[PDB]
Amino acid sequence: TNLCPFGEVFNATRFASVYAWNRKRISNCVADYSVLYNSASFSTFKCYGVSPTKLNDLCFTNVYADSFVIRGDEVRQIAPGQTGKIADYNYKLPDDFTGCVIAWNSNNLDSKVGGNYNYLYRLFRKSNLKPFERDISTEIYQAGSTPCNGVEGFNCYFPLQSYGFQPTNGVGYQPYRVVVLSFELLHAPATVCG
Amino acid sequence: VQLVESGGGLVQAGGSLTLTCAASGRTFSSETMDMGWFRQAPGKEREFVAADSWNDGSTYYADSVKGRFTISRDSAKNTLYLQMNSLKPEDTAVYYCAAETYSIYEKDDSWGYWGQGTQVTVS
Amino acid sequence: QVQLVESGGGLVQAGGSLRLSCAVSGLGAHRVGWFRRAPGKEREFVAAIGANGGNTNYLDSVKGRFTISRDNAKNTIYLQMNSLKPQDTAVYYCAARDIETAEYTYWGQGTQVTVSS
Secondary structure (H helix, E strand, O other): OOOOHHHHOOOOOOOOOOOOOOOEOOOOOOOOOOHHHHOOOOOEEEEEOOOOOOOOOOOOOEEEEEEEEEEHHHHHHOOOOOOOOOOOOOOOOOOOOOEEEEEEEOOOOOOOOOOOOOOEEOOOOOOOOOOOOOOOOOOOOOOOOOOOOOOOOOOOOOOOEEOOOOOOOOOOOOEEEEEEEEEEOOOOOOOOOO | OOOEEOOOEOHHHOOOEOOOOOOOOOOOOOOOOOOOOOOOOOOOOOOOOOOOOOOOOOOOOOOOOOOOOOOOOOOHHHOOOOOOOOOOOOOOOOOOOOOOOOOOOOOOOOOOOOOOOOEEOOO | OOOEEOOOOOOOOOOOOOOOOOEEOOOOOOOEEEEEOOOOOOOEEEEEEOOOOOOOOOOOOOOOOOOOOEOOOOOOEOOOOOOOOOOOEOOEEEEOOOOOOOOOOOEOOOOOOEOOO
8 A cells, every 4th residue: 555666766866777677576566557658748649559549357367577778779779579780688588478669759868069988888889689588798809810809800809889869869879768668467466456 | 885895803903993894785674685696805816894784684604704803793873882802912804894785686886976996905 | 070180200219108199180070090000901999089088998008008088178188108118119000980971081090109128
């Protein structure tokens, strides 16, 4: 019998890094899951599962919520079973899931003279990454027999790169903030149900 | 949270002093689990100084930190106060000062206002 | 574009701090580095600093008082060789980290400062 934590996460200065997603669990509370759909402040909204206006009778028990900031034109790579040459190397999602992803503008706060350079993203560490797993590999990419070990030789380049955006953002390449929720129903007691 | 990492000091350093370390995390009761990551130990070799992750998590034995060095980590008040050990002159006493943040995933690390790793210092 | 040039140098008997800066016309979100000119047919890596300033790297013979930092106003770059001794030779190569697509690729220069007994 308490207010849900949904109001303590939205409208935050920062959430996490590009290659760092934090999983959170919703505490016991009572609320309606159709409030987000009624809101007109989320222009972008895409997902799979029951319709927003009907997913109320079947109360969820398990909630997995993540939030991050990415490039605006990455919506093409946010889809189930994606086989993009870059997406799988950083993020991957399976087709057997029921959940919804929303995105909105991120330039309202991440704007200043000289652009933004705090965000970093990886390119390649060893091979394609399976979904639901992360690793921190500091080893430099190897493209030959002699181990460069940080030497700028044999195509040994730094795998991580930072964003760059001018305050005069034009085309939709400007960064966006993306939040993804997944709901799982089980016979175990449900934290939220009514 | 402090970037400077150092260990305790016995009479060898002119007197007995309390440990100087801080624990970084969202809350003191973030989680009840035992684990660790690289957490570069004193010297070139890197070992798990302490896998407790909270107040008396679980005893862990490592070559870098053997029975000669106390194995305990406390996240209360983001500070360390437990005495390490009564060593003998002509020795080294350096202890890592860091802690994990709050997150369900493994290898938790503070994001937003923290940088990977910390400065290496000795007493 | 970004203009990279280096010209100057000079040194005296062992004294205080020594400061040389590789001229750069601002670095917004692009990398820059220094290359060791070892006695061989190829150069060697020295250090690389990202835009965020993290992931700092140094050679085996650089850990210690030597440090490098960046400024948020004019991207001023500090150098190593603080508290020199009459044994070191100072010749580097400024590199623009040609892996980038700002306008083009550019190459820097360096000096041959030396010390005296």
